[PDB]
Design an enzyme around this catalytic site. Structure first.
Site, PDB file in Angstrom:
ATOM      1  CB  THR A   1     -43.097   0.873  -0.440  1.00  0.00           C
ATOM      2  OG1 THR A   1     -44.152   1.536   0.851  1.00  0.00           O
ATOM      3  CG2 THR A   1     -43.168  -0.226  -1.296  1.00  0.00           C
TER       4      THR A   1
ATOM      5  CG  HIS B   1     -38.659   7.640   5.187  1.00  0.00           C
ATOM      6  ND1 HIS B   1     -38.907   7.022   5.908  1.00  0.00           N
ATOM      7  CD2 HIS B   1     -37.337   7.847   5.270  1.00  0.00           C
ATOM      8  CE1 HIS B   1     -39.288   7.194   7.104  1.00  0.00           C
ATOM      9  NE2 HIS B   1     -37.177   8.243   6.918  1.00  0.00           N
TER      10      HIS B   1
ATOM     11  CB  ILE C   1     -40.675  -0.367  12.484  1.00  0.00           C
ATOM     12  CG1 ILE C   1     -40.283  -0.771  14.135  1.00  0.00           C
ATOM     13  CG2 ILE C   1     -41.798   0.656  12.794  1.00  0.00           C
ATOM     14  CD1 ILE C   1     -39.620   0.013  14.873  1.00  0.00           C
TER      15      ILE C   1
END
Lengths: 147, 149, 158, 158, 149, 149, 147
Positions: free
Chosen positions: A115, A117, A111
């Site tokens: 880049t 978290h 999804i």
């Protein structure tokens, strides 16, 4: 198209493992084991998700085309659909325990981008597939992509 | 003479000797025991697993590994070479070689696609993790000759 | 040579790692023993007497200067707390990657009460995730839980 | 092996360094010759025909991957411009520090018309003054002026 | 009139005349001797060494040098122009011209890369160093017309 | 086995052999000549110059250098060891050894005081420069085993 | 006090060079050449600047004390004063060419701190002294400081 590439990797492991388990060489030289790109006489299994319908259909399209184009017989493909990427490892485990399949191919779309978290779902999918391959001693190719 | 292929072979040779010493008969006592491996490759059997990305570079590392083994007393007839497409699937091939009782060590050579540098990639994490688990489970050295592009 | 011996090594990570091993070795020996009668809350803690215990040390050779001061720190900790130098087994390995596998071999011996792992890690001058450092920590932690024997972590960053 | 040969090497610092050596070698051969009659401003420039010239190459072994592509770049520049492979002398040295001393030995031979120096330099990830890099440039420059023979500079930073 | 090539030529002319006067015998006395060079180029031979790199700018510099010499009474017949690939090899070519007994002065023209260096540049430092040492050893004026991009 | 003292000895041994080959008889021709030095220390004479700051570290490097020479076929009776107070004055001592005709190479070992890092220090600049000039002038290898604190 | 240290370095080079130029060893062991810390029978020369009078006097104080305290004979010291640091190399060259001196000591104080924009005068002083030592084959100690 990752689908074409993922299928190609699987073909040339089913051949390699077939060679390794066979009789050894005659000695007198350095043994070299290798896998060809002929898919004749091989059984495959494909596990595909159902998220980003447009993208996945193109990937499953390439996998089936690659197997047939390299000499495979279309009747030797088993396709399994699952609701999402989180359910790929468990389905692949069931399909890999059958003694009639030689390799498994995983197709899916993640999804979040490249880049984030950090992503827990993405890590588990890759982590689970790797453990299955080592535990069952059977190749499993990894053909997912990132949106 | 200074490539990662050369270094990986040395570590494999040394660790193979060290394990042969540890499970042998112990010392007489009365002093602190020190165990270390020699660099004599005679009588040892090795297996190598190499990927295919950057055919130019990988060929160089594989040649270095073979050169190191033979120069240190290795018999060229005792090297088994297995080649694989990409880095994701070295571990499964390495597992097959390690389970043979005729192999004393395994050397893994490959090159990784340097993606977005600061972040975490999943192919690199899995290849390293898989090799580590195999060595501990099977109790046999597995050297990590992998590099980055 | 006397210049090397004159330096102090109390307090370096070799010292602390060895000290933790001594405490854990005594603690387990108490737990396996008979339980207390009762009538109060029952507390356990390991003594710091090292007489009668067997130890193993695994140390890498990378950065030969730093490691030696760490290994000598561990040895003096055992000796100064009552241990004998005849009950220490030392194993040396090419690099940090193969510490866990060597530590596994030592830990499976029935004559070893604890294992100490010493090494140094290369720090790249920009903070990325290190795939070698994580594997050492992961491997050592798994071995201790599986074998049910304490293993102490004594590595440093350059 | 054929994969190595298929790569292109036109334009790398090995190519430019060799090309400069060819021009300078021809230029000097013209200057030593008889002067022009006069009657106009007299211009000199070196031709790019390499037939009949002798060359020497000094290359370090550090970073064996990068250097080889540079050395092969220099050789093909000489050959593709008319030179013969029998008139090239190649010398290999452990590291960049000892390039100048080896280059001096080659330059003193009477059978050499020019010398090419190839190597790579380690770049620390913070910009300090490098005491090794400066010595290579200083040494090579002095040798050319003292011996009165062109020497070309073909090093790169990692 | 405003380019460094013009300025470099004037300095070469003045230094060449100054040297000519110094070798003359000293005066009788009765005052402080003062030596200086005049700006007439008649009867003097010059040499120019120019680099090809970044040719867009040097042609204007070489343009000024030749124009200045002629404008100040110099004969174009006495200019020798030498061209070299890059700035690294200006000193070696300049040395060959300076050793000719028919040359009174030498002018060096070139362009150097941007000067926003961290602390130092290893190619620029050698051009200036070599020319300076060469002038003192041979006892003949050599002018520095090099500029920084 | 991996200290700068070990590396410096190898470079000295190899360069000593290479120079012995270059000034010998040339090849037969008809093919490209390639010159390289072997790692056979037999028959070679070495000199070493070591400073004194950080007596612990310097002793380690000097031992490594001696170990490397002997292990590669060196005769322990052919090593001359000269010790000096600080880094500023290695070059003058190294010059004395290099001028003997019984010495084939010189090895310099020392440790520098790491001052204000970003800036330029004069002791470090002079020690490196002095060694470089000596080698070129005397035409004899001089290896730089120096390090930083 | 750099003056004491600079003198000590000079003493133990005059001894070392005296040993090296002497007869060699008997073989059968690794030759080791060494310099003691006895200054008896040695001649020295000192070149000192005249800038920061307070600091330099302390440095020249230590040098003379060090030589005498280690057994030197005070009559074997030649002292030369120069206007500034720029004039040290040339004076040292004249004093080092005499055949009656065994070592030379340079004392001075530089003007700008340890974090300048680079200093040309400081570089030349250190550069010149080093060349003299190699060219004349005679030790020259470097005992300057930075304000």
């Amino acid at each position: 198209n990752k689908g074409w590439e993922a299928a190609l990797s699987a073909i040339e492991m089913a051949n390699l493992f077939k060679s390794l388990r066979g009789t050894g060489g005659s000695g007198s030289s350095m043994e070299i084991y290798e896998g060809k790109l002929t898919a004749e006489g091989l059984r495959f299994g494909i596990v595909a998700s159902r998220f980003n319908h447009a993208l996945v259909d193109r990937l499953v399209e390439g996998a089936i085309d690659s197997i047939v184009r390299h000499g495979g017989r279309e009747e030797d493909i088993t396709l399994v659909r699952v609701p999402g990427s989180w359910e790929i490892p468990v389905a692949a485990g069931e399909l890999a325990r059958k003694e009639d399949i030689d390799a498994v191919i995983a197709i899916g779309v993640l999804i979040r981008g490249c880049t984030p978290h950090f992503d827990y779902i993405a890590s588990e999918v890759s982590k689970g597939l790797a453990n299955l391959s080592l535990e069952l001693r059977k190749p499993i190719t990894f053909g997912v992509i990132t949106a």
